[PDB]
Design a binder for this molecule. Structure first.
Ligand SMILES: C[C@H](CC(=O)N1CCC(O)(Cn2cnc3c(Br)csc3c2=O)CC1)c1ccccc1
Length: 356
């Protein structure tokens, strides 16, 4: 079926997990992550409690299964077992849960630090007083960036807006402590950009006049090749911040009952597939990229299919982030534990039908 068409298998549609399946594929094809994950020492773990073991299972099955892969034990493991869990959280929050879990499980192993190595960048947020000599600098790690979309035509304009200087004057002067209220400038600077760049687009904005979040379907364009050197405080001549589009997570509709899919070119070679739960299919570059720009603001239709998250990988890191994964990257002990796991579930299904 879809494994035979594309080389890639899908994930089952099992309840309403919204953006989850999209995110799981995204992470699975972050090959360096997937390798580290197989290396976690989950020997002792409980399969319905351990996010690390449950993820190993999902990735292993994605790598070896010919049929669509289930996620029930994974959702049970991090406790998001209803629509409501998914409705209470942004996509990046789920991603943070998965990454934190596996990062913690890599402590004291041969693969410790993989998660910050791949996903962590450095920024500094500042408030500079204009008339007095005072500055507050807050250095922060980030694993993702939330880009403003409203009134922005493209990623370049969002980044421009992201690093824009805000004037704190008049009615909103800065409380400068013992200097009293002071005229000031506020901004954020990027010190580094991580090898794997996760960008969420801010389409689900609070609306005062309906007192709810509403999805903004406006046009927002993102390129295949993304140069970010100009947003770095200090550029690097031997490692320019040139990024290549890896994944486009897409939503259709106006609510969490809409359709979620993800487009990926897993090898970073511009050859794209559409991942729609159990159906993986080849698609054009144009289907993956421009057709998810949205807008088209055309009267007969409501056009509400568009990108909400993008994954870019730094050109200089691409061959290493998307380093290939072979049978040798899956420890035998893990393979045995996962077969043991498939047998125990094959027995729980037989015991469940007998009682009914
Ligand atoms: C209705 C549906 C809900 C949903 O699944 N998502 C909630 C929003 C989502 O987290 C993207 N996203 C992430 N951080 C933010 C922030 Br912070 C402000 S708005 C914002 C946003 O929009 C993706 C998952 C949706 C889908 C796509 C775009 C807009 C709405």
């Amino acid at each position: 079926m879809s494994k035979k068409h594309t080389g890639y298998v899908g994930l089952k549609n099992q309840g309403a997990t919204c953006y989850m399946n999209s995110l799981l594929q995204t992470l699975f094809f972050t090959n360096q992550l997937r390798k580290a994950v197989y290396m976690m020492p989950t020997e002792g773990d409980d399969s319905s409690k351990s996010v690390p073991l449950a993820l190993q299972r999902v990735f292993y099955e994605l790598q070896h299964s010919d049929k669509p892969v289930g996620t029930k034990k994974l959702t049970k493991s991090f406790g998001w077992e209803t629509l409501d869990s998914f409705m209470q959280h942004d996509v990046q929050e789920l991603c943070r849960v998965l990454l934190d879990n596996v990062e913690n499980k890599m402590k004291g192993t041969c693969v410790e630090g993989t998660i910050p190595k791949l996903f962590r960048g450095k920024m500094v947020s500042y408030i500079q007083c204009k008339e007095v000599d005072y500055r507050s600098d807050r250095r922060e790690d980030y694993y993702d960036i939330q880009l403003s979309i409203k009134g922005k035509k493209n990623i370049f304009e969002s980044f421009v807006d992201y690093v824009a200087v805000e004037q704190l004057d008049g009615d909103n002067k800065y409380d400068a402590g013992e200097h009293g209220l002071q005229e000031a400038e506020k901004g954020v600077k990027f010190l580094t950009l991580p090898p794997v760049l996760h960008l969420q687009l801010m389409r689900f904005m609070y609306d005062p006049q309906t007192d709810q979040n509403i999805k903004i379907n406006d046009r927002f364009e993102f390129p295949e090749q993304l140069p970010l050197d100009e947003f770095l405080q200090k550029t690097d001549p031997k490692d320019p911040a040139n990024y290549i589009l890896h994944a486009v997570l897409v939503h259709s509709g106006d609510n969490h009952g809409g359709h979620y899919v993800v487009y990926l070119n897993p090898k970073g070679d511009g050859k794209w597939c559409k991942f729609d739960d159990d159906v993986v299919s080849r698609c054009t570059k144009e289907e993956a990229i421009e057709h998810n720009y949205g807008g088209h603001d055309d009267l007969s239709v409501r056009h509400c299919t568009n990108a909400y998250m993008l994954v870019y990988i730094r050109e200089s890191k691409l061959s290493e982030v998307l380093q290939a994964v072979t049978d040798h990257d899956i420890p035998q002990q893990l393979v045995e534990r996962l077969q043991e796991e498939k047998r125990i579930e094959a027995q729980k299904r037989k015991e469940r039908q007998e009682h009914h």
